[PDB]
Design a protein around this ligand. Structure first.
Ligand SMILES: *[C@@H]1O[C@H](CO)[C@@H](O[C@@H]2O[C@H](CO)[C@@H](O[C@@H]3O[C@H](CO[C@H]4O[C@H](CO[C@H]5O[C@H](CO)[C@@H](O)[C@H](O)[C@@H]5O)[C@@H](O)[C@H](O)[C@@H]4O)[C@@H](O)[C@H](O[C@H]4O[C@H](CO)[C@@H](O)[C@H](O)[C@@H]4O)[C@@H]3O)[C@H](O)[C@H]2NC(C)=O)[C@H](O)[C@H]1NC(C)=O
Ligand SMILES: *[C@@H]1O[C@H](CO)[C@@H](O[C@@H]2O[C@H](CO)[C@@H](O[C@@H]3O[C@H](CO[C@H]4O[C@H](CO)[C@@H](O)[C@H](O)[C@@H]4O)[C@@H](O)[C@H](O[C@H]4O[C@H](CO)[C@@H](O)[C@H](O)[C@@H]4O)[C@@H]3O)[C@H](O)[C@H]2NC(C)=O)[C@H](O)[C@H]1NC(C)=O
Ligand SMILES: *[C@@H]1O[C@H](CO)[C@@H](O[C@@H]2O[C@H](CO)[C@@H](O[C@@H]3O[C@H](CO)[C@@H](O)[C@H](O)[C@@H]3O)[C@H](O)[C@H]2NC(C)=O)[C@H](O)[C@H]1NC(C)=O
Ligand code: NAG
Ligand code: NAG
Ligand code: NAG
Ligand code: NAG
Ligand code: NAG
Lengths: 207, 222, 340
């Protein structure tokens, strides 16, 4: 029915975004834009027609089953996720996000052991912060007594800071109080474009 | 002008049912269908069905037949949706929509120009729960990072400020994450000078309105 | 020479002064006599585009019929908003007669004589007429009654078949009588008889026809999913009384026993929802004595289940709730054009 591509699109202000949609049927195709936490807005219909309040920058075109939506001169407001539609059917969506270009900045790395208060509840969370870095790609590597930890943690990233254009990431490794008290050396190893070599911030349990 | 006033979002458990209203205004309510569409984060949008307000004729998507009911009140231009036998798949933001072409002579349903604000519906077997706020104490360039770990709360959202809002510089509150337990958890960090860990006091003000719990957690070096 | 245009049409009929029936009187007051010798001139080497779903004739007929009901089917009370305007509720001798629609000077109706013409697209056997054929303004849901038949094969009509929001009109090429009765001496309970064999043969033919517009997908009928009784049931008027009939047995997928006489449960209501627009109307309790209406079923109004992703099925449900489509089912072959 409707195959929409690509899944994601990371672009800087000024560039042009080209989202594609493949149909197998025919009839009025439309494009919608959804900004984080808001209702979708009709952007284009009949494949080529702009809606009210939509500027020249947005344009659509067609070839057989293929439909493109083209957004020239991207700006902050334009970023979000886009959907194609044919009658009642929708595409899987394409997330278009903002990456304002800037000079490379290495992460500040901090590690936090579990608080005593948390340990008292019979659970333990080790937190690793990567502060103010660019670009957004980065890798966190948990190690417990030099043992690589695969699948015991969760990451979370802020959106690009409006003031300095950096990113921050937080990684949380969770364990049973007994497991936490089984081992000694808790290490967080960070790799990034700004680091000539991986950086390991660490600590020993109960010190 | 055309305004689709929706009823607010709600919290549901699996097996319960939900009811949503959408008030139409600014146009003749009988002229064109009213549609219901759900949007789940990271998932293909799902048209549920339309209702033609004149007789209340409906067309329900195959997926929902039996579970869904669409009615309306012509005397007050309000549309109604009920969804029964909820599971966690029914967690989405439910909208009511109306096409652009809408005249007494003709309509085109599927160019959704008008949307309601939305109604976030979450379906989980988790009950409401206040968060536990644990310190992320600093240790020893010339800056130290400290913060709050806000663990095990349901549902969203929770709000975090520092020193009653008097400290906004270098503050990063992270997007909460959903643990396999079903509860949520987020961290909020802040960078400060190293020459202040013994002078300036740092308090993390966490407020979780649903459970009505407020915590002023003081973060200090261990 | 000519170009598409919208004007104000005038009506013609065979209404007589001695007939006191309501629609007849209306026609003596609103219409001119039917032209005794109608001349239909054929147009040679002419192809023209018709569009039954964009035809002002429908709008005019709608306003006329609204007027007609306004002066003939006067309800006892009308519940608006709001107010509750009460009024007089006489006995109603109502039985629809054929009305012809005619163009004023400078205009002329073009007619499509293509046998299997579906209502939109080019027609290559166009002719010129001054008047439509006689059209009875018969207001009904799910089933189209006492209309004209398709001249050759069964015809599926839709503004766009893939748009589930669009009504589907099935035009039959052979009608099937429906015999509705309310006995004398519960005075609201009635029934409708249909020859099972005929109806099932016809339905078979419409499924096999629908199958051609859906690339050999399995075709399934189902009862309505919701809505007012006027739309979830076969709703019509007989002898001034308002009938509602359960048509479930009419759309039985298995029957393609089930070949005897199909008998439908019916009900006569006094509190109805007005098709004219918003509001309920109350009518006086049913008259006494046997009430009987025998009608010809000429068309069916369908709605296709949307969201039908995957599957090898397509599901259709009766009705169909916009009376303008009743008018379109008759006016499909005409269009008004201006000269010069
Ligand atoms: C419900 O509504 C829908 C429409 O809303 C109906 O779908 C269509 O109906 C008609 C009649 O059958 C046909 O419409 C087509 O429109 C095209 C014009 O669109 C513009 O964009 C084109 C993009 O490229 C298309 O054409 C090129 C060739 O020029 C093809 O290579 C390409 O695959 C695209 O099809 C532009 O090129 C064009 O200039 C327009 O600006 C027409 O191009 C198209 O031509 C058809 O017929 C040609 C032969 O005469 C044939 O060569 C083409 O391939 C094409 O089939 C056509 O007029 C569609 O055919 C039809 N749907 C389809 C299959 O696309 C739908 O019918 C209706 N539902 C029902 C049941 O009635
Ligand atoms: C679809 O189309 C068909 C016709 O093609 C319509 O069928 C007509 O229905 C109307 C209304 O039901 C019928 O009108 C009635 O005709 C009767 C005729 O009486 C016969 O017998 C008497 C003796 O009793 C003779 O004098 C007469 O000549 C006839 O042989 C009347 O009985 C009916 O009522 C009359 O008397 C009562 C008395 O109380 C009055 O209240 C009435 O106002 C009226 O004076 C009535 O006139 C008509 O006969 C049908 N036509 C045919 C030939 O079948 C369908 O109605 C239509 N369907 C829909 C849904 O529109
Ligand atoms: C009413 O309309 C229907 C069509 O919707 C007519 O039924 C159709 O009848 C034709 C022949 O008149 C059939 O076509 C023939 O099929 C055979 C079988 O392969 C073939 O040998 C012939 O060449 C021809 O193509 C057609 O199958 C049939 N359609 C359906 C759906 O059954 C019917 O005849 C019409 N009735 C009246 C009263 O005019
Ligand atoms: C945009 O759409 C056109 C029409 O199908 C297509 O040919 C083109 O490849 C698309 N753009 C890009 C960058 O591929
Ligand atoms: C009606 O018939 C015409 C014949 O040209 C065809 O083009 C059109 O698609 C048909 N419309 C529908 C929806 O039946
Ligand atoms: C209509 O049905 C009634 C009641 O069953 C019957 O007496 C009458 O003969 C029928 N009329 C026709 C035309 O078949
Ligand atoms: C029902 O309809 C068929 C159509 O062929 C007809 O031949 C038959 O006599 C009718 N039978 C009954 C039960 O009246
Ligand atoms: C119609 O008939 C079926 C079975 O005869 C019954 O279940 C249903 O409630 C009736 N009424 C409607 C409006 O479907």
């Amino acid at each position: 029915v409707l195959t929409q591509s690509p899944a994601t699109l990371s672009l800087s202000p000024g560039e042009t975004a080209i989202i594609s949609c493949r149909t197998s049927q025919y009839g009025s195709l439309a494009w919608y834009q959804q900004r984080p936490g808001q209702a979708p807005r009709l952007v284009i219909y009949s494949g080529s027609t702009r809606a009210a309040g939509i500027p020249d920058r947005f344009s659509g075109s067609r070839w057989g089953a293929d439909y493109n939506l083209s957004i020239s001169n991207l700006e902050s407001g334009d970023f979000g996720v886009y959907y194609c539609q044919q009658y009642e059917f929708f595409g899987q969506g394409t997330k278009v996000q903002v990456d304002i270009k800037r000079t490379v900045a290495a992460p500040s790395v901090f590690i936090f052991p579990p608080s005593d208060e948390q340990l008292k509840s019979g659970t333990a969370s080790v937190v690793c912060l990567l502060n103010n870095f660019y670009p957004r790609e980065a890798k966190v590597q948990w190690k417990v007594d030099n043992a690589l930890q695969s699948g015991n943690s969760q990451e979370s990233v802020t959106e690009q800071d409006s003031k300095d254009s950096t990113y921050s990431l937080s990684s949380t490794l969770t364990l049973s109080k007994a497991d936490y008290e089984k081992h000694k050396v808790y290490a967080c190893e960070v790799t990034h474009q700004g680091l000539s070599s991986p950086v390991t911030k660490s600590f020993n349990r109960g010190e | 002008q055309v305004r689709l006033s929706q009823s607010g979002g709600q919290m549901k458990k699996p097996g319960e049912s939900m009811r949503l209203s959408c008030r139409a205004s600014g146009y003749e309510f009988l002229n064109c269908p009213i549609n219901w569409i759900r949007l789940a984060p990271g998932r293909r949008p799902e048209w549920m069905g339309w209702l033609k307000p004149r007789w209340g004729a409906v067309n329900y998507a195959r997926k929902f037949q039996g579970r869904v009911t669409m009615t309306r009140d012509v005397y007050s231009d309000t549309a109604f949706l009920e969804l029964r036998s909820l599971t966690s798949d029914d967690t989405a933001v439910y909208f009511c929509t109306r096409g652009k072409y809408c005249t007494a002579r003709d309509y085109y349903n599927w160019d959704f120009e008008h949307w309601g604000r939305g109604a976030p519906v979450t379906v989980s077997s988790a009950s409401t729960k206040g968060p536990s706020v644990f310190p992320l104490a600093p240790s020893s360039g010339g800056t130290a990072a400290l913060g709050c770990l806000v663990k095990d709360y349901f549902p969203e959202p929770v709000t975090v400020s520092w020193n009653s809002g008097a400290l906004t510089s270098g503050v990063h509150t992270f997007p909460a994450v959903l643990q396999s337990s079903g509860l949520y958890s987020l961290s909020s960090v802040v960078t400060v000078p190293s020459s202040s860990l013994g002078t300036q006091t740092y308090i993390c003000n966490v407020n979780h309105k649903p459970s009505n719990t407020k915590v002023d957690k003081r973060v200090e070096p261990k | 020479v000519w170009k598409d245009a919208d004007t104000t049409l005038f009506c013609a009929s065979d209404a007589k002064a001695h007939e006191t029936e309501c629609h007849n009187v209306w026609a003596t007051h609103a219409c001119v006599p039917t032209d005794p010798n109608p001349q239909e001139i054929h147009l040679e080497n002419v192809t023209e585009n018709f569009n039954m779903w964009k035809n002002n004739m429908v709008e005019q007929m709608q306003e006329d019929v609204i007027s007609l009901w306004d002066q003939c089917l006067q309800p006892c009370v009308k519940l608006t908003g709001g107010s509750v305007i009460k009024q007089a509720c006489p006995k109603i001798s109502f039985d629809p007669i054929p009305i012809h629609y005619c163009t004023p000077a400078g205009y002329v109706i073009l007619k499509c004589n293509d046998k299997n013409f579906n209502g939109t697209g080019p027609c290559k056997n166009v002719s010129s007429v001054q008047c439509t054929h006689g059209i009875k303004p018969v207001v009904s849901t799910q089933l189209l009654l006492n209309g004209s038949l398709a001249e050759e094969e069964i015809i599926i009509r839709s503004e766009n078949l893939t748009n589930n929001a669009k009504t589907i009109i099935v035009h039959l090429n052979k009608s099937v009588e429906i015999n509705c009765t309310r006995p004398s001496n519960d005075i609201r309970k009635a029934y409708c008889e249909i020859n099972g064999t005929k109806w099932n043969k016809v339905l078979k033919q419409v499924t096999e026809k629908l199958k051609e517009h859906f690339n050999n997908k399995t075709i399934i009928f189902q009862p309505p999913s919701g809505g007012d009784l006027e739309i979830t049931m076969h709703h019509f008027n007989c002898r001034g009384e308002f009938f509602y009939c359960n048509t479930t047995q009419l759309f039985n997928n298995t029957c393609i026993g089930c070949n005897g006489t199909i008998t439908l449960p019916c009900k006569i209501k006094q509190i109805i929802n007005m098709w004219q627009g918003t509001g309920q109307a109350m009518y006086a309790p049913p008259i006494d004595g046997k009430i009987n209406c025998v009608s010809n079923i000429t068309g069916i109004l369908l709605t296709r289940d949307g969201g039908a992703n995957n599957t090898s099925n397509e599901t259709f449900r009766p009705g169909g709730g916009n009376i303008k489509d009743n008018w379109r089912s008759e006016l499909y072959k005409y269009k008004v054009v201006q000269i010069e």
